[PDB]
Amino acid sequence: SDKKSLMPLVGIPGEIKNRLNILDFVKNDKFFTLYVRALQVLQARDQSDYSSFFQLGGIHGLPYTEWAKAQPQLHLYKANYCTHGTVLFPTWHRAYESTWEQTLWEAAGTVAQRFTTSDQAEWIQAAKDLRQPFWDWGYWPNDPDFIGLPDQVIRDKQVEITDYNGTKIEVENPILHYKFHPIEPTFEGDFAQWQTTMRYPDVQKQENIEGMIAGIKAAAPGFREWTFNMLTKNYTWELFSNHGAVVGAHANSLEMVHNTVHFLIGRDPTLDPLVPGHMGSVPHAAFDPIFWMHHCNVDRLLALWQTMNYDVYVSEGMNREATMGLIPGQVLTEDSPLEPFYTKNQDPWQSDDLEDWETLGFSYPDFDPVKGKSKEEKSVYINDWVHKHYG
Amino acid sequence: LDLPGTRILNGANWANNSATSGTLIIFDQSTPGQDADRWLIHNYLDGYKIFNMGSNNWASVSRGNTVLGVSEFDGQTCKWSIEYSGNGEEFWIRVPREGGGGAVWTIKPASSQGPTTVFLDLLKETDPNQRIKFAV
Ligand SMILES: O=c1cccccc1O
Ligand SMILES: [Cu+2]
Ligand SMILES: [Cu+2]
Ligand SMILES: [Ho]
């Protein structure tokens, strides 16, 4: 038996604290400095280190190697860890997001110790209060000029943070790109030709950032309408969680809406043939820092739907494609294993364990006003809040 | 809305089982009755249980190194390991044994001239009669 995982998924210990909207997050000078610094530390780490940006990103898809396992298997099934188009879609990505979050948290903690100013108590405290922010791609405030992503995430080549002696400094933006060191050998085709993660590539295999931004704005009303439907039109887990056996069967699901957001950053739809960026492709996606922001809002939208449809969770569904943890042609229930994620007791994480999201050490501003109230009270209030916000 | 289950294949021949002890698990290309060829594989503890939608029988280790279908679930004989073979979409179904090394499913006739049922021998990584693929 012994240890199965060298890095168990434990979440964040101590007080429950919120994952904040990215727009307010960047305005917090302390949180933003810590995020960028922590991110700098993860990106610098050796790509063979299971607690590195590459390894954490490499869990999702490529490369097809085992992540933080004490003993290797005899015959490793080379495939994605992530489960896509199955009933286990929203739950697996909750585990995945927290696995990331605990590594970002543990890295930021050691950064806050480095500060040599007098306000270091406010730094040490900010380090525990730190969480991964989200991008609310459903909220359009009725403004064609609006973008749900600040300049520190999609434009700035250099971001301003605070150095350990109080001085303002400019550093390379670690949220913008991620530089491979080196490019993964199993990356084929175009992705074998990019030293950094690429967003919304043009015909000449280069980033079209302004074309990406125009496309987000123009679909922003259409996404308000689509997110609002997804939350208040789905009443079963089956129709909410997966996009369907034949992709494009469940138009209203979280996944299907979540799909079209990946392409907004990753893939220009007017190109023939398609030139996908990292975010535009499953086996490369989780290498782009924006992935963690998009999947923080996915987990948020799941939490909002959970509050409304309480005690409606994972329903049984088939597993058609073989992932690295899941047998092709098996049934998936709430008790099905979420590889490569293991509990502090060396058991595979299961949906059942992470139904209550606070067990992992986070919440969402939306849930502040209804703290302590009953499921029914939280149900009413949130369903009003979704109507006030995305209606 | 009902789940379809899966087909347990060996090359092209699919697995089937009829009601009525412990009945044989026949591997051929003709289904005896309704849903006799569809299986439901849930995770069970640290392995898997296998259920036939047609006969409602569980794939069980039976006294005499054969794999038969049984009516009542029994955890000592109805749990299985499903390990990847190393090539294609082929798998070994394995008797969970202390630390590993347990006997694996083998698709060969009993005393020749068929029918080709399931048996239990030591794993031979090259033996095609042990390779199992699943299709929904
Ligand atoms: O990143 C993705 C890209 C394309 C399609 C589907 C799902 C994804 O998660
Ligand atoms: Cu994914
Ligand atoms: Cu995604
Ligand atoms: Ho469970």
Side-chain angles (χ1 to χ4, degrees):
Chain A
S1 303
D2 205 17
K3 283 174 74 174
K4 312 280 193 195
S5 184
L6 305 165
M7 254 156 263
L9 195 202
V10 288
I12 322 295
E15 265 196 20
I16 302 306
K17 286 298 204 293
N18 287 355
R19 292 170 158 176
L20 313 158
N21 188 303
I22 186 61
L23 298 154
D24 295 314
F25 179 90
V26 297
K27 301 209 283 182
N28 196 301
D29 181 78
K30 288 207 179 75
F31 276 151
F32 183 72
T33 303
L34 286 167
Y35 192 92
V36 168
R37 284 300 203 196
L39 212 63
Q40 277 193 325
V41 159
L42 297 189
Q43 292 191 343
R45 279 167 184 191
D46 197 316
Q47 292 191 143
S48 64
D49 172 17
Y50 295 107
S51 46
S52 68
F53 190 83
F54 175 89
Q55 277 299 304
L56 271 91
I59 295 160
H60 196 252
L62 294 157
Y64 300 145
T65 51
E66 306 202 61
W67 182 85
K69 301 297 182 81
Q71 283 182 320
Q73 289 192 350
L74 193 60
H75 298 280
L76 170 65
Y77 197 98
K78 298 196 273 283
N80 300 326
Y81 266 123
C82 68
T83 170
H84 304 95
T86 62
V87 295
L88 289 179
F89 167 82
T91 59
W92 193 95
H93 287 100
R94 174 162 280 161
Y96 192 40
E97 187 78 14
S98 269
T99 310
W100 158 257
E101 197 171 53
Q102 68 172 38
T103 311
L104 188 85
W105 187 77
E106 276 164 21
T110 55
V111 164
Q113 303 292 320
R114 292 181 59 95
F115 283 96
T116 52
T117 45
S118 56
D119 66 332
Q120 57 183 308
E122 294 176 334
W123 280 111
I124 271 96
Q125 192 51 233
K128 43 183 71 192
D129 296 345
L130 179 87
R131 294 294 185 275
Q132 172 77 34
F134 58 93
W135 164 34
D136 198 8
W137 37 254
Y139 170 71
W140 180 63
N142 224 53
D143 191 350
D145 226 76
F146 175 83
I147 177 94
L149 288 155
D151 259 356
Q152 297 90 326
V153 177
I154 52 165
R155 276 204 196 97
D156 304 354
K157 267 83 157 282
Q158 281 96 57
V159 283
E160 189 184 289
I161 56 163
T162 317
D163 211 324
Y164 306 111
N165 68 356
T167 334
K168 302 287 183 197
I169 54 151
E170 63 158 307
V171 284
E172 285 288 302
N173 191 341
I175 315 154
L176 184 73
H177 302 124
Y178 169 70
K179 179 163 275 186
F180 290 101
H181 55 113
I183 300 172
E184 168 54 42
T186 50
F187 281 167
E188 316 193 68
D190 256 344
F191 303 95
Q193 300 296 304
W194 286 322
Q195 275 297 141
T196 58
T197 59
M198 298 268 92
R199 304 186 185 169
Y200 217 75
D202 57 6
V203 203
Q204 293 166 186
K205 270 86 151 155
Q206 280 163 334
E207 285 191 322
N208 179 16
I209 294 301
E210 285 312 295
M212 178 192 68
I213 294 164
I216 294 159
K217 291 184 196 159
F223 264 93
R224 189 220 279 179
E225 202 179 318
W226 204 5
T227 309
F228 175 80
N229 269 12
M230 172 272 288
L231 295 156
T232 60
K233 254 59 182 169
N234 290 307
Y235 298 100
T236 63
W237 184 264
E238 169 56 46
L239 296 180
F240 164 78
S241 54
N242 62 279
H243 54 49
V246 182
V247 64
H250 305 330
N252 247 47
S253 57
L254 213 188
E255 196 175 19
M256 179 52 65
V257 178
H258 145 279
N259 290 331
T260 327
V261 184
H262 268 282
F263 301 123
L264 286 173
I265 272 82
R267 199 183 65 176
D268 183 310
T270 62
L271 261 60
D272 201 351
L274 293 164
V275 186
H278 298 64
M279 273 289 280
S281 180
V282 191
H284 318 262
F287 286 119
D288 199 319
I290 202 165
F291 181 97
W292 303 120
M293 299 182 172
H294 173 38
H295 268 273
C296 179
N297 195 71
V298 170
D299 191 271
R300 174 184 164 261
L301 286 167
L302 166 68
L304 287 163
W305 184 94
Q306 285 190 222
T307 300
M308 298 176 283
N309 310 73
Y310 57 94
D311 307 295
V312 197
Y313 202 53
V314 177
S315 62
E316 306 198 48
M318 299 303 304
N319 176 49
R320 290 184 174 80
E321 276 86 58
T323 79
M324 192 168 279
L326 300 169
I327 304 308
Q330 74 154 133
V331 188
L332 304 172
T333 75
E334 68 175 12
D335 294 338
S336 299
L338 304 171
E339 291 289 333
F341 315 110
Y342 279 73
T343 46
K344 75 204 164 180
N345 293 358
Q346 296 299 317
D347 299 302
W349 268 91
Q350 287 161 32
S351 311
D352 204 2
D353 314 318
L354 49 82
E355 186 172 15
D356 194 324
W357 55 86
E358 275 153 19
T359 199
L360 294 166
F362 63 77
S363 188
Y364 294 103
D366 312 52
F367 302 97
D368 284 7
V370 289
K371 263 172 49 46
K373 292 180 197 174
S374 66
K375 291 159 165 193
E376 171 60 15
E377 276 152 348
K378 296 175 176 191
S379 190
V380 176
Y381 181 96
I382 282 296
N383 197 253
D384 284 18
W385 168 245
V386 176
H387 269 72
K388 281 181 162 74
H389 212 242
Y390 308 116
Chain B
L1 300 154
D2 280 311
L3 290 174
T6 192
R7 276 188 158 180
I8 301 174
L9 299 141
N10 178 64
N13 292 303
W14 53 79
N16 27 237
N17 178 256
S18 296
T20 304
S21 60
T23 48
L24 293 152
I25 306 179
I26 302 166
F27 265 89
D28 57 19
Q29 285 183 227
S30 59
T31 329
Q34 184 171 23
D35 280 322
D37 64 339
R38 318 295 311 204
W39 302 84
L40 305 163
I41 304 149
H42 296 78
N43 312 75
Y44 181 76
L45 277 72
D46 65 322
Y48 308 87
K49 61 174 198 258
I50 309 169
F51 179 86
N52 188 335
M53 298 174 76
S55 62
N56 307 121
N57 277 359
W58 305 93
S60 170
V61 182
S62 64
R63 195 185 160 274
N65 300 25
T66 71
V67 184
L68 307 176
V70 297
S71 315
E72 310 274 284
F73 185 87
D74 177 343
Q76 317 292 9
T77 49
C78 291
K79 191 172 89 177
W80 299 102
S81 298
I82 309 166
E83 283 145 33
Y84 182 46
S85 69
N87 61 124
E89 271 95 50
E90 303 185 326
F91 282 83
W92 296 309
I93 307 171
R94 202 154 194 178
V95 174
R97 205 165 161 262
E98 181 78 297
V104 303
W105 278 33
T106 318
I107 298 84
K108 64 165 200 291
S111 201
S112 281
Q113 295 92 252
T116 329
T117 59
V118 196
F119 287 92
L120 294 171
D121 303 76
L122 186 68
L123 169 63
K124 211 181 86 176
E125 284 208 22
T126 66
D127 193 1
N129 290 155
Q130 320 217 258
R131 313 284 186 87
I132 298 298
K133 33 187 164 172
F134 308 91
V136 180

